């Protein structure tokens, strides 16, 4: 609980940070420095089946469990950094990344700016597993 201050106007600010890959979805607010956390919870924990780790509905549930303690500790508002697996990995967003954002905005926290932060590399380190491609 608690609150940086009474502020019948402006809102105490943190960082939202969502990593959407496929097979899961992390939501995550931290202090705008980053060094200090605040309430995490993934799209995994709120369903069982592995196959359903990453589904938007789970993602919703997670952004809901997160927004709770967010507005329960002190953050009134949050600026978001959405991400993909990145690296040489896919470079496209995972499915319950949108769902998480809709869930927290809908929840009734506050939104501020957006950038994508997936790590794109001035390319190399050879991508995994070999030349002939995953065959399948």
């Amino acid at each position: 609980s608690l609150g940086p201050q009474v502020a019948e106007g402006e809102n105490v600010f943190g960082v939202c940070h969502i990593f959407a890959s496929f097979n899961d979805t992390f939501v995550h607010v931290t202090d705008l420095s980053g060094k200090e956390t605040i309430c995490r919870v993934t799209g995994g924990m709120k369903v069982k089946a592995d196959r359903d780790e990453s589904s938007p509905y789970a993602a919703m549930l997670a952004a809901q469990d997160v927004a709770q303690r967010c507005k329960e500790l002190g953050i009134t508002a949050l600026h978001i950094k959405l991400r993909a697996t990145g690296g040489n990995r896919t470079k496209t967003p995972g499915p319950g990344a949108q769902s998480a954002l809709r869930a927290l905005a809908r929840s009734g926290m506050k939104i501020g700016r957006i950038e994508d932060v997936t790590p794109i590399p001035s390319d190399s380190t050879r991508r995994k597993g070999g030349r002939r491609g995953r065959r399948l």
Partner: protein, 215 residues
């Protein structure tokens, strides 16, 4: 075994921006209650927050970001200093279009106060309206002479003047325009920005300048 939920223990500080910016009350951040076994100011002091120049100015500065680093603490107040400017991702990605030449030059330079900076610029050739080639590349000769011009300016424009004037400079984007003037004689160019600035070496301390800039 149940224990120590941590927010119920944490303390709040109000992040303060340098003077050249406009409004200066960045937001708030939480640290642990200082215990002799600890310096909440310790876990507080080299923190860096990245804020959008638009929130910082108020605007057209949608793209552009400034990195603000906490340089000291005074009771619930924490005075930050310029640490960098980058662009984001969307903006940068949006300039980079096929059929045009992408030109990059960067230079590393020491300011009047010591700071060592690596400072990048960028530009793209422009088709000019009654062109009817579809593309609009530049020649190798062109880019080599254009880059020299960009580099000469960036060293010229940072050598003279301290971290603050570079800042005061990068806001109204006076470098951009200056490049545009020195380069149109050589080849078109659409876009043009100093797109990033990287702090390489910091001078020693001095609360004097920091306060001059804050306070």
């Amino acid at each position: 075994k149940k224990v120590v939920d941590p927010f119920s223990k944490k303390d709040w500080y109000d992040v303060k921006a340098p003077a050249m910016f406009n409004i200066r009350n960045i937001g708030k951040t939480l640290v642990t209650r200082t215990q002799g076994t600890k310096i909440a100011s310790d876990g507080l002091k080299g923190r860096v927050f990245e804020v959008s120049l638009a929130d910082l100015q108020n605007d057209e500065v949608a793209f552009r970001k400034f990195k603000l680093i906490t340089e000291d603490v005074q009771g619930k107040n924490c005075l930050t200093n310029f640490h960098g400017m980058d662009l984001t991702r969307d903006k940068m990605c949006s300039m980079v279009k096929k059929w045009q030449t992408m030109i990059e030059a960067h230079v590393d330079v020491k300011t009047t106060d010591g700071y060592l900076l690596h400072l990048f610029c960028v530009g793209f050739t422009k088709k000019c309206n009654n062109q009817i080639r579809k593309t609009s590349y530049a020649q190798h000769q062109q880019v080599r002479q254009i880059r020299k011009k960009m580099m000469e300016i960036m060293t010229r424009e940072v050598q003279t003047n301290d971290l603050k004037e570079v800042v005061n400079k990068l806001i109204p984007d006076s470098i951009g325009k200056d490049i545009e003037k020195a380069c149109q004689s050589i080849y078109p160019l659409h876009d043009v920005f100093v797109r990033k600035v990287k702090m390489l070496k910091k001078p020693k301390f001095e609360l004097g300048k920091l306060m001059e800039l804050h306070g």
